[PDB]
Design a protein around this ligand. Structure first.
Ligand code: RHR
Ligand code: RHR
Ligand code: RHR
Ligand code: RHR
Ligand code: RHR
Ligand code: RHR
Lengths: 84, 84, 84
């Protein structure tokens, strides 16, 4: 009943730690591709996409941890509006 | 007679708690897939679908808790219209 | 659970060492192309792009190591703002 929620939360915590590690790894890979001697352009594009997505997701993770409470508040507001 | 309704409501409550936990887990999985070093596109698509469905359902759950009262009100209105 | 994070961090460390080495190599290649007897202009342009990207990435690597903590702080601030 509740142990299932507890184990789901533990899984989410471990996944979040791994996600921070992987985000840093992706940032490093992107900025390493961008500075290498290879003068290609496709690889610069790949590095840019990597670092940009890394920053984006790293921001949005904790923001989503907040987003769900925000959505609950919006549900409360619309319920109070429609039903007095 | 009434204990059956009570146990159904308890089941719904436990399920709702588990559902919030799983929604947060899905959000984390999606945003982890989106920021990983893998430069594939299918996986970015999967992550986008995950996070979008997560937000959608997280909104619609409590909204539905309201939706059923809204539907009852609509039934009352149409009954009052058709039968004076 | 945690050994996976540890090995990801070790991979990032090795990659960072290699990245510093490659940045120095790219700087050397660029400044060697720029001073060679060849009077072409396209090659001067290539050397300029190489040395500029090298300096840029060499700066941004450690800065990003800080950027992720900065983003976490911004997430904390916006969470505190939206939810009292
Ligand atoms: C990769 C990812 C998929 C996994 C990651 C995370 C993993 C690590 C966790 C694994 C999660 C697992 C697969 C799903 C959870 C199990 C569900 C069925 C819980 C239902 C809620 C549950 C707490 C209710 C408690 O039962 C009431 C008990 C009293 O117990 P108590 O008083 O505490 O002693 O009543 C006794 C019996 C005799 C009552 C019989 C009624 C019967 C049980 C009704 C069925 C309930 C419902 C119809 C099931 C539907 C749930 C699914 C739609 C959700 C599945 C999500 C899935 C995609 C992961
Ligand atoms: C090039 C680059 C791609 C690589 C560079 C770096 C490389 C060198 C590292 C390689 C990284 C590898 C490929 C991905 C990591 C593995 C993931 C699945 C970890 C999930 C998190 C994990 C710690 C949780 C721990 O499990 C809980 C255990 C208890 O264990 P314990 O208590 O410690 O004994 O529960 C027992 C079972 C029976 C529970 C069953 C539930 C089941 C496990 C749920 C699935 C979990 C989740 C849905 C997986 C989704 C994760 C992916 C979206 C992320 C992949 C990123 C990828 C692009 C690299
Ligand atoms: C697609 C990638 C995955 C390819 C990856 C390949 C890589 C893994 C292979 C490892 C290193 C390779 C040996 C690189 C070979 C580079 C060739 C000269 C091909 C040039 C590419 C074509 C399309 C040109 O398109 C780009 C223009 O630059 C010109 C490149 C410098 C301007 C040359 C340098 C100019 C002269 C001085 C070179 C001297 C010749 C030999 C003595 C040097 C060794 C030759 C050689 C053994 C090593 C090459 C070391 C590189 C870093 C200089 C932009 O083109 P664009 O932006 O698209 O418009
Ligand atoms: C479908 C997925 C489930 C596949 C998952 C596989 C994954 C679980 C396996 C783990 C890691 C793999 C070893 C990834 C291997 C990547 C190959 C180079 C295949 C490229 C994919 C094909 C279709 C290209 O399509 C995409 C273009 O990017 C180019 C990728 C970079 C631009 C390369 C990097 C370029 C050069 C510098 C690489 C240097 C070679 C070795 C020294 C590095 C190690 C090689 C290697 C051991 C690890 C690869 C680390 C990745 C993150 C860089 C877009 O293609 P598209 O968007 O579709 O148009
Ligand atoms: C499915 C719907 C029913 C979902 C409805 C949810 C809704 C009822 C909830 C109410 C408001 C929510 C709090 C929205 C949260 C938005 C998240 C950032 C998720 C982004 C969605 C993912 C898939 C991205 O996919 C789309 C790309 O845009 C990026 C969005 C802007 C570009 C961000 C804005 C960028 C930065 C500056 C935001 C700053 C962060 C906080 C300080 C702001 C508050 C955060 C927050 C509390 C409110 C969000 C206010 C929105 C209107 C900006 C296209 O993706 P696609 O077109 O598919 O390829
Ligand atoms: C695109 C590159 C990858 C090409 C790389 C080629 C390279 C790997 C080949 C190795 C060395 C070559 C033998 C270079 C040959 C240079 C030719 C004279 C072509 C001139 C280029 C055209 C477009 C002119 O455009 C540029 C103007 O300068 C004029 C060059 C000096 C001003 C000449 C020197 C003038 C007189 C005194 C030369 C005497 C002739 C022979 C006795 C000398 C040996 C000839 C020869 C065997 C070696 C050349 C040694 C170079 C470093 C001087 C700017 O033009 P721009 O800036 O664009 O407006």
């Amino acid at each position: 009943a509740a142990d299932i929620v507890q184990m789901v939360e533990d899984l989410t915590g471990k996944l979040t730690a791994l996600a921070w590690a992987l985000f840093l790894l992706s940032w490093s890979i992107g900025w390493t591709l961008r500075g290498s001697p290879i003068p290609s352009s496709r690889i610069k594009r790949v590095g840019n996409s990597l670092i940009e997505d890394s920053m984006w997701a790293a921001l949005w993770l904790a923001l989503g941890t907040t987003v769900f409470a925000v959505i609950v508040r919006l549900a409360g507001i619309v319920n109070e509006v429609l039903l007095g």
